[PDB]
Design an enzyme around this catalytic site. Structure first.
Site, PDB file in Angstrom:
ATOM      1  N   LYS A 125      -2.407  -1.475  -3.414  1.00  0.00           N
ATOM      2  CA  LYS A 125      -3.225  -0.254  -3.377  1.00  0.00           C
ATOM      3  C   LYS A 125      -2.317   0.963  -3.478  1.00  0.00           C
ATOM      4  CE  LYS A 125      -6.291   2.397  -0.308  1.00  0.00           C
ATOM      5  NZ  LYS A 125      -6.675   2.258   1.165  1.00  0.00           N
ATOM      6  N   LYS A 163       0.827  -1.181   0.000  1.00  0.00           N
ATOM      7  CA  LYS A 163       0.000   0.000   0.000  1.00  0.00           C
ATOM      8  C   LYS A 163       0.852   1.217   0.000  1.00  0.00           C
ATOM      9  CE  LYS A 163      -3.450   2.476   2.557  1.00  0.00           C
ATOM     10  NZ  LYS A 163      -4.517   2.395   3.589  1.00  0.00           N
TER      11      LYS A 163
HETATM   12 ZN   LIG Z   1      -5.633   3.657   7.829  1.00  0.00          ZN
END
Ligand SMILES: [Zn+2]
Ligand SMILES: [K+]
Ligand SMILES: [K+]
Ligand SMILES: [K+]
Ligand SMILES: [K+]
Ligand SMILES: [K+]
Ligand SMILES: [K+]
Ligand SMILES: [Mg+2]
Ligand SMILES: [Mg+2]
Ligand SMILES: [Mg+2]
Ligand SMILES: [Mg+2]
Ligand SMILES: [Mg+2]
Ligand SMILES: [Mg+2]
Ligand SMILES: [Zn+2]
Ligand SMILES: [Zn+2]
Ligand SMILES: [Zn+2]
Ligand SMILES: [Zn+2]
Ligand SMILES: [Zn+2]
EC number: 4.2.1.24
Lengths: 329, 322, 329, 322, 329, 322
Positions: free
Chosen positions: C254, C199
């Site tokens: 992500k 992420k």
């Molecule tokens: Zn968070």
């Protein structure tokens, strides 16, 4: 690079001698394991309509038939008990009964044919009223670790009976390592574990459920919470990787022909002893067709050669005796 | 370092929704090619003993059935003509006859269903009196290059009939190149060639021989052999194949997987007549459930096929339409 | 090798039927996960200017909308609570409140739609006054292991609420293994963990912060001490490797489209179930353009097909309902 | 993550039946090629001092012995003529003589045993007065391309004699291509070429020189070199070889393994005269058991050979027949 | 690609200087280890008919001969004691006798030639009445872990004697790790362990059994329950992988020339220090042929060069002295 | 799963004997090529300011020194002529002069030391008035194909002089192929071509320019680039190079490693004048020990070079002779 007509791949095919010289794989009796359905009682022999040519055998009859199997050089049998209905239960206790069919059978064959390999089946499905491979919780889900505890008792009972190989066919996570730990603790140092590593939730198992008598128990039930989704290939590699880490001496793919690509990936990735199960529905399909005159009998050896080519070391097959006879030639 | 119990592979299996999310392969109608046996007459069908449920179809009957095939979304058919005996010969001339069954059927389909793919069979075996895939020398050996010359003429006649794909099934060395050159030289720039690249000398073919109305170890591959299949496909791709095929299918899924992995090219597989008959006979005997059909076809996808020639195509497509 | 004109790659493109036959990837509803912003209260529905077409929904309204989502075959929802301002705190205690929005929502949807997958968000950022994903020390640094302790309480609360999947989106090191250990200890054997593994510290998250209401909390703040540097690719493989070792059942990248190369590397290297988040700013970008008439609506499915092609199994996307409608066709 | 004691590799070793199940390679008669030294006369055999148990055979004697070879299932022989001195020359013309020993022997065998493979030796070394594998320039250098021209004529004469395989053992650059082109141009479409691709300048050859009645570092490979063998095989395959061979054998098993792994092509290995003599002398002195023969041949299979040229072929086949 | 005649691979072969420049491998004295059979007693020297040119030597005589070995630059000796018959037993206790031949020899050579490497043999086969490499159970099977306990005592005794390297040649599973643990516990931090990792059940060992005097003990006996099946290659990689995990500093393949493909795979896969044993039967074969005039003496260096080319770092060879003499040139 | 303390990598380091046993690479005299700058006159040497210890040598002086080089076992020399200014031109004609320094030196050495390898330099830079490696167009761009034509003539003159190896150092595209074709067409079958395949536009060349008496970014490679070097070598090998070289050397060891790993072909490296001068200056200033010479050359071997062009060759060989 190789280009026609400098390269004509027909040249090696032109004569039998050159086809022989270049032939990449050969099936031998060393590759064959014979599964056998074992009845309680004496002088019992039962034909299985959905597996033409296959009989369930009481142990006395198994001992007689095993003479020829041994004479033919078949290395091992895989035993599947046909548990009496009234011995099925929620707790699958018969699985570890020292006087269960599998255990009695094992003891009998170990004494009579000391060199013959006996591979017992470690699973609760022949023993449960519901036909699932483990113990159910109150939602009807097959509990993982509770089932392993029973599988462990089972496997130890098999080792005590003299089996050289136990084959957990249950698809609970972690059961290989649990069984290995228990065998090691108990001093069963050299009992092999043949893990059914990538065993799929398949339609090709129908005839077996009829042969062992779980079909009526399972009914329309499914095993998709533990057996693998036919769609999945990469996942099989993770299954095998875990089972090798957990101590499996051999790993298996099941079913077989509908999964040859999985056999190939598994052999290529792990370079470990790799087995495959030509399942009841495979055997039935082929027999059906042979008996109808739709396929020549030569399809038998072609089907088995395919497993070798795809990377299997050993093949559990209901055709083992016929194959071995043909090989003996 | 994934290990139990931190890793429990059953978690994803616990529920339908997670099985669906992680499901690695899915059969769709886009994967299906329907082989069909085509008769010479009018208003005729014939049942095939060794292929329960499959019918030989006259062209008018073929056009009627293709309406449903097209409605189901089946992308293409593979045509196999059932040559009348009187038209068989040693020289296989009927193969390039502009009014041969395959050519007639192709024209009729291209006109009625312009979007439907038509894959013709380029081979001499429906046309020889002896049923070998090529022209025999005086010792009964199937001559490679002499056979190619006929195959080439055949292929051209199919392009002229409007076939979008020609599929050489003959296993002569070098034919893909020869046929490509001919097509290009004739201006058939966009006719695809679907090479039967790794086609084995197999016992699984018996039923198709009964179907079409038609000992090959000198051209078809030894079932034992896998590395050799890679060399076959490599040549075909070099020679201009747009698609490459393995045949038979299920008994050779390891071949499919290797071929796809090695060449990353459009890869096809033939679930042959034997494979169909074994499955349909077991299903009919009640030994196997109907679900085995989709399982067998899913296997091809998992193994790496883009497309599957299967006699189950209609049934599969109907089930997919649900 | 392949050379023009023997090889003309246009031939397969010439007709729809052949494009279909050779098409390498296809999006299906089985690939779609719908993120949803969940409000407290009753009969509440709020449009999000920076996410045109997206509404925050109170739980009653979510239940109504979920009827069509289920009818459309969408396998799972990912829940994001819009925490009331006054429930934010330094200790993020609301994260584990059994009566928190996420927990109430989960219970409601689990009862109403037993087959629908619910993926809860494990992170403290909806719950902190400062908007960071963990607890701050006195230098304002997001403490790793102290934050995990809260995340663990949170995840357990989700499992207790019935969530089938918890998705730690926090990027603390080691949190997957800590959460897995806690779930296993607690008997939540089959709660999946969908790790947000790679992420990135991205500019594409703006609209989400507005949607959940952390934007005002975070202000100009950044997450570069825990979220990954957009520049880095090899590092993502180490992140995923750790999360798989620690027991993740799925791993996620992500954002999404700006990271498709990471999706591809992750699928190729690990062959594990791989997910990707088409983030708020991705959705907003595309919607903005579609509504301006700059891009055709067909861009929706093209964007989602890209995730499949890049190797994702599943896609968290605000376009899930529209996509599923189009797929139903 | 396999680790003791969860993994104990002895478990599979515990019993014969499990050893057999996991056994990775198995020598069969299908793997064996018997080299044989052929004399010019009639009703004659000669013993070879440096190859105990191997006899040079006149053709009538060869035909008698081949009856048992064929009965044992040995797929092919490799013929090496023992050229009478009077027929040696600088120009090696005897190599393409239609009545040379190799050609005579080939015709006689092809007629009597039509299924038996015959692999002829394409090289000038049995024919040159100096015993080099090619034609010498005035400095004593073996000329590459001039040598090829002779080899080509030789190869054609073998095809005309009915040899199914010709095996160039000469290590001239480019010869495989030259020979293939000639065969194709002459219509010998199906004559295989078994290239001696990686043939080393080795001390293990001495006994074969005594056997045939026949300083090569400018053509044969340096024993030190492994990568170079891959380049040799690559060229040969490009040039049209149907099979590729490594020679010597056991001292080069690493080469066999690399070649098989790299090219996945039909791979052969020659257990040369020295390798035979060392083993048979040790067996005869009682220093090694007879079981070493099958062990040495199993090694070739494990290393990746499809076929093995070995003077032990008969003995091995007999043992396999048990 | 490379094609004749643009590429003529004869060009580099045309002259010695270019063959030298491109030569891919070279044998040096740094690659050689000399195995030596060591007798009890004083002024003892015994010819071995099945190993022409090799003598068993009492320790005084070994010390004399070792002068030239050192002068020649040979890095290490591998010691094999010829145990007196009456010191063989079921319990193999002589294996760990601080006054055993191997131990005395080691002490003597360590003092006299401090820079010379001494590699002792860790195995029970010179010490058992039955000639097996471990202790037998009541079925005559070589017990794995019971044998390791003796091997551990042995190895410690060697380290105490000053050996820089111990070489477990026994093929019990797990013995490397057990020996490593014991050496580490005991403070023998820098004692190397040269594992015989892939040691096959071979026919090429006959002459050694005669040289050390186990031949009469073993009789017709076999070692197929512990030594590897010659057929197997992938299995060797699993053997080496275990031994490296267990702490081996070097790994060995035995026999040698009949296994060069295994050497190559092992070097390629693990990139670890890789050794190979040119066994007694290899030495005998070649000597036999050389003495008969069937092979030139140049075969010696060709055989040893093959090990280098196949990937060995070091070669245990009875030809070490002659090779080293030729190298000195 | 090797882990401390079961694995302690110091164990093998503990003693000389174990270091020697596990030592992965060893420099030998077989790895060394000595570059030498050759003057036009008689009984002359010149010192080179930027290359301490290296002398330009007249041919008679070269022959005297080569006696010791040969005695030390150095396999080959690389000759670089120092062209008198009067003989420089725009058309570089002196490059193919049969009585040019390189040609004279080659003949004299081939006659005196027949076993010594002679590697000539195929390039125009010692011959152009401007010192570029090729012929300039009117914009000062080094013309590729026009330059090749001169290089070809140059190469032929070296073959005629008896050079066993010609080494094109020019970095024109395609020259290796052109030169090979010319050599083959002229019958110089065994003349090797040692391509300078990956030669960088480097600051490390300054001293060599002073040595020979001779702004290249349009032909020499950008130091930043690594993948590009693989494409360069691939072409050269396709084009017929027998050996491929990277230049400079130490600053490019990663290139050596990639090249060896990718192509498994005979791989050479040039420790260029700058690399020499930096090392020798540090050694002379007393900042680095003499042992750095063998360390620098060992690096080349470890990196995957088969041979090394180095101005340290004599010193190294002497140290090896100990
Ligand atoms: Zn968070
Ligand atoms: K074979
Ligand atoms: K999916
Ligand atoms: K498709
Ligand atoms: K087997
Ligand atoms: K060298
Ligand atoms: K060494
Ligand atoms: Mg599992
Ligand atoms: Mg082909
Ligand atoms: Mg992380
Ligand atoms: Mg060659
Ligand atoms: Mg071991
Ligand atoms: Mg270039
Ligand atoms: Zn079960
Ligand atoms: Zn045909
Ligand atoms: Zn020869
Ligand atoms: Zn031992
Ligand atoms: Zn230049």
């Amino acid at each position: 690079n190789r280009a026609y007509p400098y390269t004509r791949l027909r040249r090696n095919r032109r004569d039998d001698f050159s086809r022989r010289l270049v032939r990449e794989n050969v099936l031998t009796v060393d590759d064959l394991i014979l599964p056998v359905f074992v009845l309680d009682g004496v002088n019992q022999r039962e034909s299985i309509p959905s597996m033409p040519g296959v009989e369930r055998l009481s142990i006395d009859q198994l001992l007689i038939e095993a003479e020829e199997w041994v004479a033919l050089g078949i290395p091992a049998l895989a035993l599947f008990p046909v548990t009496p209905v009234e011995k099925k239960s929620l707790d699958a206790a018969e699985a570890y009964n020292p006087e269960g069919i599998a255990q009695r059978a094992t003891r009998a064959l170990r004494e009579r044919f000391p060199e013959l390999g006996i591979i017992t089946d470690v699973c609760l499905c022949p023993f449960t009223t519901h036909g699932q491979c483990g113990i159910l919780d109150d939602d009807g889900y097959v509990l993982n670790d509770v089932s392993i505890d029973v599988l462990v008792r089972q496997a130890l009972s098999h080792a005590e009976a003299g089996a050289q190989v136990v084959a957990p066919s249950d698809m609970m996570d972690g059961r290989i390592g649990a069984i290995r730990e228990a065998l090691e603790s108990a001093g069963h140092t050299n009992v092999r574990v043949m893990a059914y590593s990538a065993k799929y939730a398949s339609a090709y198992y129908g005839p077996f459920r009829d042969a062992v008598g779980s079909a009526s128990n399972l009914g329309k039930g499914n095993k998709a919470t533990y057996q693998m989704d036919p769609a999945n290939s990469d996942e099989a590699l993770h299954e095998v990787a875990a089972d090798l880490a957990e101590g499996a001496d051999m790993v298996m793919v099941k079913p077989g022909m509908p999964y040859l690509d999985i056999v190939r990936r598994v052999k290529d990735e792990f370079r470990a002893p790799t087995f495959v199960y030509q399942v009841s529905g495979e055997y039935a399909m082929h027999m059906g067709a042979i008996q109808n005159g739709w396929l020549a009998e030569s399809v038998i050896l072609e089907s088995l050669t395919a497993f070798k080519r795809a990377g299997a070391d050993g093949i559990l097959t209901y055709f083992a005796k016929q194959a071995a006879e043909q090989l003996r030639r």
